[PDB]
Design a protein around this ligand. Sequence first.
Ligand SMILES: [Cl-]
Ligand SMILES: [Cl-]
Ligand SMILES: [Cl-]
Ligand SMILES: [Cl-]
Ligand SMILES: [Cl-]
Ligand SMILES: [Cl-]
Ligand SMILES: [Cl-]
Ligand SMILES: [Cl-]
Ligand SMILES: [Cl-]
Ligand SMILES: [Mg+2]
Ligand SMILES: [Mg+2]
Ligand SMILES: [Mg+2]
Lengths: 586, 586, 586
Amino acid sequence: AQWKPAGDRIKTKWAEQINPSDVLPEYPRPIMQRNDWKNLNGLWDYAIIDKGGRIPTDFEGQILVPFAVESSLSGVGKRVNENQEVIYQRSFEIPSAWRGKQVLLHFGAVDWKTDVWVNDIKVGSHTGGFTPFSFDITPALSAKGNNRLVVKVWDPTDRGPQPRGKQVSRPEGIWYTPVTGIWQTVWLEPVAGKHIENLRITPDIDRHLLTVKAELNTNSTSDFVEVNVYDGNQLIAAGKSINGEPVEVAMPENAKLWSPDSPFLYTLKVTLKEGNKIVDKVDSYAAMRKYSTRRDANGIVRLELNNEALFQFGPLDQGWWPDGLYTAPTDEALLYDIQKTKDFGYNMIRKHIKVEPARWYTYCDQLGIIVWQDMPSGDRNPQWQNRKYFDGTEMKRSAESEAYYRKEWKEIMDCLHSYPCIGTWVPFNEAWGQFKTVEIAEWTKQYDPTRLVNPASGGNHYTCGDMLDLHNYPAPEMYLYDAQRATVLGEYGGIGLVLKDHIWEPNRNWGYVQFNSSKEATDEYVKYADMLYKMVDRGFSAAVYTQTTDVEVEVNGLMTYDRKVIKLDEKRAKEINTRICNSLKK
Amino acid sequence: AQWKPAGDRIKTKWAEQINPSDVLPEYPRPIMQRNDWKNLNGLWDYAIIDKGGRIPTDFEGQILVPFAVESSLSGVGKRVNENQEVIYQRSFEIPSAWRGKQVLLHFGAVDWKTDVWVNDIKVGSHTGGFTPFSFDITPALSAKGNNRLVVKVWDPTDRGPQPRGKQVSRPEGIWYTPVTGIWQTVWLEPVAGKHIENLRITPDIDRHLLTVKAELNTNSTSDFVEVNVYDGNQLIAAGKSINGEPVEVAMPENAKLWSPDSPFLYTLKVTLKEGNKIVDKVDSYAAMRKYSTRRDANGIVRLELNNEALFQFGPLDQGWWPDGLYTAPTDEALLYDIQKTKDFGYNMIRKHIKVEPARWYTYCDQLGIIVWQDMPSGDRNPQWQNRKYFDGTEMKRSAESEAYYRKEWKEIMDCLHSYPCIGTWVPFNEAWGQFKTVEIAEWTKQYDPTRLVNPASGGNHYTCGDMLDLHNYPAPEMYLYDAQRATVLGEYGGIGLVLKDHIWEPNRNWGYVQFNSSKEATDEYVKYADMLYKMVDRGFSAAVYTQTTDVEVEVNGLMTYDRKVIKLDEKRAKEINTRICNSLKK
Amino acid sequence: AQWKPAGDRIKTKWAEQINPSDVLPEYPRPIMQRNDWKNLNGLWDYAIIDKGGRIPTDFEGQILVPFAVESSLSGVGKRVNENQEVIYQRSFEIPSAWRGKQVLLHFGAVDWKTDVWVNDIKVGSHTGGFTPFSFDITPALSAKGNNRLVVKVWDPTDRGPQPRGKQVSRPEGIWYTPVTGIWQTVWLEPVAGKHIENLRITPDIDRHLLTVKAELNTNSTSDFVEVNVYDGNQLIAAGKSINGEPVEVAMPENAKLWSPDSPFLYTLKVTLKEGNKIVDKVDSYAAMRKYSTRRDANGIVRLELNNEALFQFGPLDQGWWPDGLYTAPTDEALLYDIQKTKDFGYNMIRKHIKVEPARWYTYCDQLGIIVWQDMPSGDRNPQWQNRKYFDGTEMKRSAESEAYYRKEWKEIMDCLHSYPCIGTWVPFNEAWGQFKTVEIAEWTKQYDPTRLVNPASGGNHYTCGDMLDLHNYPAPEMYLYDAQRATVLGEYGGIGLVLKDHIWEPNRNWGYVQFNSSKEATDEYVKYADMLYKMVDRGFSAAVYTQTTDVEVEVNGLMTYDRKVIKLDEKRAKEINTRICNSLKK
Ligand SMILES: [Cl-]
Ligand SMILES: [Cl-]
Ligand SMILES: [Cl-]
Ligand SMILES: [Cl-]
Ligand SMILES: [Cl-]
Ligand SMILES: [Cl-]
Ligand SMILES: [Cl-]
Ligand SMILES: [Cl-]
Ligand SMILES: [Cl-]
Ligand SMILES: [Mg+2]
Ligand SMILES: [Mg+2]
Ligand SMILES: [Mg+2]
């Protein structure tokens, strides 16, 4: 059967541009680039089986990878419960030019538990629906050709304690449609026997230093790594190292620092050598930027970018699409939300309990958007004491649930470490699965000192981390203040507006405050923003407005769920949002 | 001299069948079978030196390996204190067919500290008297032949804090003769440079899956493992994996499940490949079975085998022999105790503070006997509060003693992991060396979730693990009950009966209750078992009778110490023991 | 310019003997000797730059390696603050006979953080100013010749929390000039591809055993180590091992035991084989000695050397030099302090919050001096409760400061493990940076049980470790006694005497007591020593007199700061010091 978008829900303009022969063709890993790769997106054979059932060899339907089974653009649009498993199967060829090289199989993200076979040979497994993973499949490849790839996915959604974000089995209110299966690009990559697996890039503008650690799959004493840094196409600095040492690149003192108003990116060329012969080399980019906090001349702790106080103001971006759920239909659509955030005068985005594909963060690096990265929530909740420092009963996770949280949080910080845009880690949000807050905040800060730590966005509040985060709806309000840290407003606004022919369901829509016209909503937004501007001088050092787009029945975004309508006046919002981003400028 | 059993104590009928040129010739590791091996059992040169003394080159007497120095069948029958060391010396030849192959020197068990030299070259060491260990002795061999094997053993018995079980220096009451030296078969094994060191087999009947993890001595990327599962001679399942991934084998949903009444075993054939070349291959077996606890329709937590409630009923088996102490004289003697347990209508055996050779657990796998595996006890004790939840002073082990416990307990669970018969781990018994009970129980359940955890058989009791274990003598009694877990009777009975021609000592013999004839003793057993049967509906979910055989002056077993007389009527006991084993049947 | 000692301060007689083309030429590592090496001491190019500044390629001045930048013998004599970095640069040729071999670059000690480049290739980094470290620089060597070596050094002194000893930015009273940069010999060494990195030598006189673990850089199964022990020229013991096992060498029962009165040293010859091919070979020494504590017949816990009670009595040696600061000008000078200690009748030396070069400890092994090794102090302090057991507020180190302490304390014990002279580890002194005393003392004893543990010299006092250490000035006093351990006097005396023309500064000189002639000071020393002798049978088991030499304004040593005048009468001191060392003789 011919592939068709499933369901009768609203769809973006990119839904009718989807070509099942060329689905999401852009390079999946701009932070470490090799020239050769093969995209495995497209139409795979799929099957939904009972958990523990036979993996079938004859399939009746097809799914469009990488769109989740519940999504419209998958061409399937079915539900998978905690007692079912999804089976992807496709054939693939290895290019003849790749002969003799190691072949890596890459997954951007699969929710939740993945088991992969190549020609009936198990090549690897993975748990965690937000992090990328790879397997070396060269021993399993066939000399004849027609390699068979089988992926077995399990996802209990909210019936299990794993990180899931807004995914629930019964969507209502603030909770959305579950996301199961392959939802990021799958691709093959040829590499040498010894190759760079990851680039750990860390800047230090105070020491005029750029550190690049090339993590290899295997090490030898004669290994040699060389890093070349380019301003445009002019080489401005270089570094070499052996013995697995991180490459310290001495940067020029007049280096161009990265910021939202001037997001300059240097270009990196990293080379690996066994002795004096080149075995591997990759392309990358880097930015000289610094995140910190410092008490200003008025006694208030501010968030600082490049040793200068900067008020961070941005929308809450949950990253949902009506046709692709977690997956943006095209690369132009993925970029669209970020560009509209710049067009609204913001300098920040809070990616809410979700991790995006690698291309999204690179776009924030290129466009100049500071990113607050949440840790996707899950499991049960303690009591939410949202307006005072927590004194209630601490919730105890099972040893298994705690292990999953710690494991996936480390993997998220690991795979997102080299991105300049990320400035703040947010381990918890509104007591969702919150546990051992002080211990996790200290571990997060100790693991990556270059970023700020938001211990719990909106509670539960503990005297730890780098900032106190208050939520309040609808208007901004400073009901709690930590003079020892920065005090921010991690969620406010939520002005709702129901624009028919552009909503997910005909009724039960809601906002924190509701109006019947775009003008009335823009007036209420400017009113809230005017209050927020006067509060910067009184204690608030950052703020997050809810939200970027409408999501399902929550119609309180700057754009409709299908992105076809901008709900608030852009020129009026840009005028005051710009004033707030420059509120601390000298 | 000529070899001759030492001492005038009672002996089993197999003591006169011992041939010192063919001592214990059966394959020592049925769970992982290669074809070629060489048995080093037999007459070694021995010497008892002062601790720290010089290792002599000339020797006066010989010892029969593998019988402990204190045992009768060793031909020595001498005592070794904590200020002495035992020195074994032996010459061995390597078969010419093994040329080019790696040669592994295997020890089944040596108590307690072992140091091994091959041609005056130290090849390894080991601490722990109950676990197997191996050394690669290939570089120490000589081309001229006549390799010299020297083993130095030290055993402080109860003068040290290490696990020892029932071994003491001054045997009396419930404490038996010390066991020092080599008490399990020593053998050689030829293997490839890369070979399978251990098979970690784990079933999952709920997911119709058999996971086989082949742990290798070295790993390369092109390593390939293939597992073939056979129902008799018919291949019914297969699995392949690379990258060190454990082999998940999809079992048929009609898979024959293992149980004491139907102990079916599948045959495994595991093959290791370096690329396309077969480099190693082993034979094994597996059983599809599951242990768990579930609350029944009456509100009582029951032990469940294969998702069905099953009452587990069996004898306490300390595994002691009058002539070989820890070592059964022949393989037919080792099997006899298990066979007589089956004949008395039991379905379970509690191996009491001892670990048996590998062939013993395989016999339980083949005959169909669930095994409760104790952790051999040692060190000092806290106060034993046997009838209430513990409230006294916790005992504090030294850092060295706790490390010895944690290490050997991990090693025991490691080498015994793949055995279907084992269903329950018992870290402590009657407060013998009991410390950090809750922490040890949680670590045990986390390290192997496929088995049940009995935190402390008979006390001290803590609200942890999978069951509450009461001891009571002589009659059964339910004086304490945990409605949140299963409640079991891990020790009861102990009906004594002195037979003149088949006891260890002339007097000082004892039972918990004593009768003068087999008829009277069987009357009391059927009396206690009738009480136990009614208590099954009342709360009890498992029970252990004391004991399998008489041991030294404790004459309360089903058989005499020398195994020549069955003390209780088998036909009357089997009829009621079978009724108790089927008590929870629906 | 041409090299010349800087400053107008007093200098030793060896300052005028320094030849800049032959500086400290003796072999830097007697505990593990290979024949071939190249000394890199001499005149390097140097530059003091801003922290984070450019590393120059052209230099204006030169420094005499290995003398610290602040020292006189460096030819520089300048101060480096925490916002500055020191840059060393020199060229070096690799001898042609070293071709094909691996070339290691050895640093004895650099304070505090070190980064090393060879031909602009980073070869390694290191933090910690008291431990040696090595780099394999072979892939960075150039075939043309004239290799360039660049060493960047950063040292915050007391502006950071790292271990620093007596170094402060503003020397006054008991605190002395900072020591920044390379202060121990830099040298090159050729080794085979597989070589012995370090020798872990541990004796056991109770088991007549010497254990030698040859720690290699890489491991193979075919590896083979042989250890030959020589009494003079006569081979008296040998041992061989494979599989990485430590070599157990059976020592003769009449072995010559090491002691201050008879410091016999056996000679070691360690050989590493790959199969039957010798690939590496090192020479070493070893001593059969044992440190312990036992309660004597009078109920007092004494320090025991070789299972016999021995009163350890020695001076406090801070190891400071007016011309070389931390670095002794010549090897003849490094020996002089130890020789005068022996000439004064002592048998022990407390190396105060400093780690000396390896030759210094070998000289203690050869001359017969027991060493109490302090952990160099740093960071902030809690309240010093010096006369009672601590009940005040515990000080909380930062996560970074605690890590630096634990890391360097392990590295100090690791590199000093094989030295016979070292008998006691002292983690803290007078509450300087004291934290988690009980945990650190238990970790220290568990890491090296062969040495005694002084938990905190002079406080803060906790019921832990092997001894209680009291400080009292000027006279001895036993205000606190621990009957469960030994009670020692780790600091007393401090008799001051100002000898003009031999002092650091003309003003602010001080002692704990001040006298005007050598006669008066010697009278007071014998008076304090007479008190100490009577106190031996009262509970004191060891004592430390302050101090070896004058250091800057603290003029209370046995010698002047320039080692030119013996301030106290040697014959009278030797007569009483010898009586105190033999006080526990039976
Ligand atoms: Cl091609
Ligand atoms: Cl290929
Ligand atoms: Cl490298
Ligand atoms: Cl509240
Ligand atoms: Cl006997
Ligand atoms: Cl061979
Ligand atoms: Cl594998
Ligand atoms: Cl090693
Ligand atoms: Cl070795
Ligand atoms: Mg999901
Ligand atoms: Mg024993
Ligand atoms: Mg310093």
